Design an enzyme around this catalytic site. Structure first.
Site, PDB file in Angstrom:
ATOM      1  N   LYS A 184      -3.831  -7.423  -4.001  1.00 23.82           N
ATOM      2  CA  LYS A 184      -5.141  -6.968  -4.459  1.00 23.82           C
ATOM      3  C   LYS A 184      -5.258  -7.193  -5.957  1.00 23.82           C
ATOM      4  O   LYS A 184      -5.438  -8.339  -6.373  1.00 23.82           O
ATOM      5  CB  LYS A 184      -5.378  -5.556  -3.925  1.00 23.82           C
ATOM      6  CG  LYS A 184      -5.148  -5.549  -2.387  1.00 23.82           C
ATOM      7  CD  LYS A 184      -6.131  -4.677  -1.651  1.00 23.82           C
ATOM      8  CE  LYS A 184      -6.177  -4.981  -0.155  1.00 23.82           C
ATOM      9  NZ  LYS A 184      -4.893  -4.720   0.538  1.00 23.82           N
ATOM     10  N   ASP A 190       0.881   4.929  -1.745  1.00 25.81           N
ATOM     11  CA  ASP A 190       0.243   3.618  -1.807  1.00 25.81           C
ATOM     12  C   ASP A 190      -0.721   3.668  -2.987  1.00 25.81           C
ATOM     13  O   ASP A 190      -1.771   4.319  -2.927  1.00 25.81           O
ATOM     14  CB  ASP A 190      -0.458   3.287  -0.500  1.00 25.81           C
ATOM     15  CG  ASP A 190      -1.017   1.887  -0.497  1.00 25.81           C
ATOM     16  OD1 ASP A 190      -1.343   1.371  -1.588  1.00 25.81           O
ATOM     17  OD2 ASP A 190      -1.127   1.305   0.600  1.00 25.81           O
ATOM     18  N   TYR A 232      -4.332   3.859   4.744  1.00 21.59           N
ATOM     19  CA  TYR A 232      -4.681   2.532   5.233  1.00 21.59           C
ATOM     20  C   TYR A 232      -4.266   2.371   6.687  1.00 21.59           C
ATOM     21  O   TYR A 232      -3.161   2.745   7.082  1.00 21.59           O
ATOM     22  CB  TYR A 232      -3.951   1.544   4.323  1.00 21.59           C
ATOM     23  CG  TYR A 232      -4.178   0.077   4.556  1.00 21.59           C
ATOM     24  CD1 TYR A 232      -5.450  -0.456   4.653  1.00 21.59           C
ATOM     25  CD2 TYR A 232      -3.101  -0.789   4.640  1.00 21.59           C
ATOM     26  CE1 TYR A 232      -5.639  -1.815   4.846  1.00 21.59           C
ATOM     27  CE2 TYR A 232      -3.282  -2.137   4.841  1.00 21.59           C
ATOM     28  CZ  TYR A 232      -4.550  -2.647   4.935  1.00 21.59           C
ATOM     29  OH  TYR A 232      -4.736  -3.998   5.126  1.00 21.59           O
TER      30      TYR A 232
HETATM   31  C1  LIG Z   1      -4.837  -4.070   1.620  1.00 23.70           C
HETATM   32  C2  LIG Z   1      -3.995  -2.845   1.673  1.00 23.70           C
HETATM   33  C3  LIG Z   1      -2.647  -2.942   1.997  1.00 23.70           C
HETATM   34  C4  LIG Z   1      -2.103  -4.158   2.730  1.00 23.70           C
HETATM   35  O1  LIG Z   1      -1.676  -5.206   1.892  1.00 23.70           O
HETATM   36  P1  LIG Z   1      -1.634  -6.720   2.437  1.00 23.70           P
HETATM   37  O2  LIG Z   1      -1.205  -7.588   1.279  1.00 23.70           O
HETATM   38  O3  LIG Z   1      -3.024  -7.096   2.901  1.00 23.70           O
HETATM   39  O4  LIG Z   1      -0.652  -6.780   3.588  1.00 23.70           O
HETATM   40  C5  LIG Z   1      -1.809  -1.872   1.710  1.00 23.70           C
HETATM   41  N1  LIG Z   1      -2.301  -0.749   1.076  1.00 23.70           N
HETATM   42  C6  LIG Z   1      -3.632  -0.666   0.732  1.00 23.70           C
HETATM   43  C7  LIG Z   1      -4.156   0.560   0.042  1.00 23.70           C
HETATM   44  C8  LIG Z   1      -4.483  -1.722   1.023  1.00 23.70           C
HETATM   45  O5  LIG Z   1      -5.814  -1.666   0.709  1.00 23.70           O
HETATM   46 CL   LIG Z   2      -9.456  -4.502   3.861  1.00 20.76          CL
END
Ligand SMILES: *Cc1c(COP(=O)(O)O)cnc(C)c1O
Ligand SMILES: [Cl-]
Ligand SMILES: *Cc1c(COP(=O)(O)O)cnc(C)c1O
Ligand SMILES: *Cc1c(COP(=O)(O)O)cnc(C)c1O
Ligand SMILES: *Cc1c(COP(=O)(O)O)cnc(C)c1O
Ligand SMILES: [Cl-]
Ligand SMILES: [Cl-]
Ligand SMILES: [Cl-]
Ligand SMILES: [Cl-]
Ligand SMILES: [Cl-]
Ligand SMILES: [Cl-]
Ligand SMILES: [Cl-]
Ligand SMILES: [Mg+2]
Ligand SMILES: [Mg+2]
Ligand SMILES: [Mg+2]
Ligand SMILES: [Mg+2]
Lengths: 398, 398, 393, 393
Positions: A213, A188, A114
């Protein structure tokens, strides 16, 4: 740890974290909003101090009952010893990496990470004396040749951001452990919502999510989590705490609440997104489909072996490079897909990137496609309506 | 900037941030909960991208209407160019300092700084190649002799944590500017709630608050703020953003809402705490009273010259060192004062520290008292009841 | 009470509800879980007595607010409602049946009147009216079927203060069993201790001063021991409740009610004194201002004033003049409701007042301006008012 | 509808309310500010038509929910209430006056019955009862003063499904002006399209499936064009509203209602089929199960099932047996309410059912167990039920 989810995962999602001490009679945990937490006596204060990282009420920055409930839920679901909480995913990534590095260390990160994660490394870590190297997501066992004497952290993201490449985590982890047994391996794990890929069972030390998410699941709350094994928990906990990292009690409650529908939501995102991917793969205006569950996609065989399902985010490459006029005609006129950042909610979303834009966020690499890339989040709408919306889009650019 | 508050401060507290674009017809701003923010067209997305730090909706981590309203309110009230938001005060301190340092830099911090601020410097900054030196809070113009070629940040906290010493900010700022005109001067301005001491009017670059305390005002929400001048805003904004620092929309709303009663609350905390301080100063069981508004307290003449009022937090030193049995007899049996960390709410609070405990958090310094120190937060209860509670406490240890 | 501020800070805050924080926990629930059959039996027996049973009866958050309200207003129980109008309508409904009669002050809040004339009337309950200064003469209006006497002091809009001791004593002489109720919103339930005067039920639009920030709606009704069970069970049969979060915010508003009210009192009396000297003002209706209707009762029976009052202009403004006046204020905002931190302004033409003054006539012909005096600097508010006067002079 | 999931995701989400986010903004307010006299006049005229006017009429957040509910249930307006019981009580009250008569199914939710027998009766409104399978024979129970016919399908606890087409047609033959209402909570307003069947008003305890998480209480009533203005204005006169945050959470619950209901249907039918084969089970009351009362009407008139149903044991359990059974479940929890993600269990002794079955007798003598089937793994739920059976065998 394999292709079949636990036969009890849905029961665990409904029950995780919901102990009487936190719920006090309701189904869900109470929302306890607090900075100050009151000690009845000096002895109670001393006991709370000793246990201030172990779920005894002490100070709002360590957590209230609401945070403890969420932390217990995340540790149960991701199989960890502790869960640190953050204002968002980007804070979780930045502060979890920072917790394990100091001047002179080296971080080895997938080149599909990311973009904010990359930018933390190049724009924050570098000026603090921490270097970052990069690897192709399909490197597998050959990552051993990239491990330096000062490599401290190996940072994975599977599937990759935007282009969706799935790592061979068993091969990567085995190679890292051969060279640098005590390295800190992090992932992640947002796309899998921490539950479709059981990262800690694969020998990863810390599983990080943008709980924003799929855990929140409704596009209306931001929060990061990091679930660590026993080896790494205390260092993560205390160093995140020194940076003041926490989440508010109400968002913690909403994350716990999101867990309860995560099973029914993910099953729908999987069914619908795989159907859309299979349709796009047959479409004459589509050059490539990047969906971990679709045969032929990069690392698909590792997804099939190592994950228990799919979420709803994926991308595809058009048969041509759209002009600016075509991009507007395409994107401006969707009826159901909306243009926005983020993903993981109930609504379907769409974004576009030209190849050179992606190449610019692939450190030390080029891209292997020339068409415009479209990233879709497949929400909970009727899939046939989503297909009709995509078909109308194709007709605007044909 | 002086001893008289603006004749319009109460009107400003009621109105700050409340523009129609944020309130949409209600008195208070709307609460807009979002990660995703939707773009109607490619052109709208491009415009939002250009203005993503300038109050156009772009992404939840940059803010929604609720955050923009609070940011405007804080910039109006503290006279700044921008306001960064954080999960708590400790995150504001850590990330604001971090935003302005890199390997090889030096930070010069008052030795009365809040302990988590000190711990960030010694336990996080040091391993990243940033050194920290310390100064007595009454150093005044002599701070010039402590500025090193690599000093980048001068960090003030006035009044000091626990012991309440007030800096001579005009003398410190003038001396810093003589030696290092472009140094970044920061203050933890929580005790003044950003409004009793107009830090940016004194040539300080960034005013940081634990908005948790008086801005929230009810002991039930945690949030940090940092208001920067035009010179420093972009670097603060972008580097805090790279660390993922934000606050949730609901806490932002509650902070804006807290502002509206901040005037009536502070006037009561001032009246009541000064009365209690004056009474304690006459008491035979009290050796010293540390209250910025009380004559004789360290730096009182700078408080009288440079502040427009007082809040409710102060401390005093008992005429003896309490034994552990006496500490329990004293603290365990209060009726109205409660033992807890934090302060700034409607309830009165009490904590105790022995001299050597304070000395341990006074880097390169010793303390000048031997009795047990008691820190009081004076809330909104009837002051005569608070006095009776303190009197009963004195009778338990006499 | 020399202890009211201490009581406001501490009311309702027991460990059972706070669980270690300063404020009560927020327990959001419909379902409340019983561990065992024995536990369910105990909860059932005590379902109206503060044992967790069902979300409509309340969670810990509601119980904490109920205890706070009972302590502050000196009652046996407190029923909670979605807003003040629901509290009024359902509290009256709880005590009437077909064939009964309600006696209501003609200065009652307009929705309270409309409930009587548009709901009760079709259910066989009649309503009569009385002047707010009737005092002991109310005994002559009491009928053999009069079940409820409904007070509101100060009155809505026009601010007349009742002689509650005279009214209560006269009611108790003629109909001792009557249910005497008061809409005590202007006093926030604390500047006038209604239950200490022999009133049975004190009703508030907690929306106003208890919430204190214009951002939440809730009604409360605090009843004495005689009337509590009937109020509680009949309100429950109508499904009346408030959400847990608004209950939390009401408890939270209590904590600053003292500092807020003292400022509202000080600022509003200063504004009223200035208006009372002003050449463009015909009359000032402020209970704390000498000369206002019922002021002598306010001075005797209340412990302070809030920030809501009104005044009458020298003329019935035309639409054009009213727009020039109201549209161009900088600090006072045009809105309904009151009790928050912002100053608000509302106009009523004297004829529209007559229309909400049943069986009475108004004794003024100018436009009535109702002001809520908020927490802004009072000199700025005075300047805003002066600029308004200059736009209509 | 082949588009119901798309509708659930999008209902109520217009730019006016979302202002750039995916979900509506949360606008908390009593006071709503008018910029000018002209603006206030326009808001006053349109105060029931979605222009901001006063918090009790709604803010942007309420308007968004109201539009969503009207779209999903096909109505002209949606009134909001603090809970389902308030929706029922105030929706009935809105259409009756002294001398009227209400005809209510004897399987109606117990609080709905108690409203009729304990509130309406003292206001001069009588109530008669009908068996849920009465069908066209309901015409014989209709009186010249019958104003309201109140349906609930499936019935509370015992789950009997009405023949709505037969009931409606018979009512319209004899009393075309009658107000036909239904408590449509079990279908979440979407599995049975009440207004398409000629019913005038569809009422829900949105607390249940619309909220979907056991943590919020709210009632809704969606009315056709004929009945909307009377419902809206009479509910408003009773002060009925919901807080903005709960309105937001109801809109938010709509977004997952499809995925939730499909799982509740699948899991509950599997459990019901297993119970129907079980030696310790006497009868299963599940509308989707062949053989259950009114199942043929469910199959014809509904588009799916939710997760709430009941079954009858082979015996009237003693207290001791009931404790051994209920106290030791691992996944099913003892609580009132339903419609959330957790599975719940509730026992009713057949005599207690008879007591809430006016002018009827129950045709079973065993203990009735009501199950809400949540989102847990169905095999785990079956194992929990099997362990319960083993504790009482
Ligand atoms: C969206 C995203 C993030 C960031 O998270 P936020 O809550 O928007 O700060 C981190 N890792 C991945 C894989 C993402 O898609
Ligand atoms: Cl995004
Ligand atoms: C309390 C405190 C902080 C820390 O703020 P939190 O919200 O508790 O993280 C920072 N500065 C000062 C002066 C404080 O007293
Ligand atoms: C505002 C008002 C009410 C009604 O309160 P709401 O919560 O707005 O319905 C009741 N009584 C008085 C005196 C009022 O001013
Ligand atoms: C639960 C119930 C109600 C009442 O809902 P509440 O919000 O709990 O008051 C109304 N109708 C039915 C069918 C119910 O099951
Ligand atoms: Cl190693
Ligand atoms: Cl310099
Ligand atoms: Cl502290
Ligand atoms: Cl009003
Ligand atoms: Cl007006
Ligand atoms: Cl129930
Ligand atoms: Cl039971
Ligand atoms: Mg590249
Ligand atoms: Mg020292
Ligand atoms: Mg009249
Ligand atoms: Mg019977």
């Amino acid at each position: 740890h394999h292709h079949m989810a636990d036969k009890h995962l849905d029961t665990a999602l409904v029950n995780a974290g919901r102990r009487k001490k936190y719920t006090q009679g309701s189904v869900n945990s109470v929302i306890q909003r607090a900075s100050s937490l009151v000690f009845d006596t000096v002895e109670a204060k001393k006991h709370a101090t000793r246990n201030r990282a172990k779920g005894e009420l002490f100070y709002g920055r360590r957590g209230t009952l609401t945070h403890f409930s969420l932390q217990e839920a995340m540790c149960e679901l991701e199989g960890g010893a502790g869960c640190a909480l953050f204002p968002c995913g980007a804070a979780a990534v930045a502060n979890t990496i920072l917790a394990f590095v100091e001047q002179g260390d080296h971080v080895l990160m997938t080149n599909t990470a990311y973009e904010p994660s990359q930018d933390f490394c190049t724009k924050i870590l570098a000026k603090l004396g921490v270097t970052t190297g990069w690897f192709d997501p399909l490197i597998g066992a050959d990552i051993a040749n990239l491990i330096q004497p000062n490599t401290k952290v190996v940072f994975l993201e599977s599937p990759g951001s935007i282009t969706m490449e799935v790592h061979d985590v068993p091969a990567i982890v085995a190679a890292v452990r051969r060279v640098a047994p005590e390295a800190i391996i992090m992932i992640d794990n947002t796309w899998a919502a921490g539950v479709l890929f059981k990262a800690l069972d694969f020998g990863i030390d810390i599983s990080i999510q943008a709980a924003t998410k799929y855990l929140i699941g409704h596009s209306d709350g931001m929060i990061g989590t990091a679930v660590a094994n026993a080896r790494c928990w205390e260092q993560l906990c205390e160093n995140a705490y020194l940076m003041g990292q926490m989440i508010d009690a109400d968002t913690a409650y909403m994350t716990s609440r999101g867990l309860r529908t995560l099973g029914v939501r993910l099953r729908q995102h999987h069914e619908s997104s795989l159907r859309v991917a299979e349709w796009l793969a047959q479409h004459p205006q589509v050059a490539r489909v990047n969906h971990p569950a679709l045969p032929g996609s990069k690392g698909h065989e590792f997804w099939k072996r190592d994950f228990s399902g799919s979420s709803g985010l994926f991308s595809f490459v058009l048969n041509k490079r759209l002009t600016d006029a075509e991009l507007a005609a395409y994107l401006d006129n969707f009826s159901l897909f909306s243009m926005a950042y983020s993903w993981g909610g109930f609504e379907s979303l769409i974004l576009a990137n030209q190849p050179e834009h992606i190449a610019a966020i692939r450190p030390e690499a080029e891209v292997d496609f020339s068409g415009t890339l479209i990233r879709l989040h497949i929400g909970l709408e009727n899939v046939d309506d989503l297909l009709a919306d995509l078909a109308a889009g194709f007709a605007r650019i044909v």
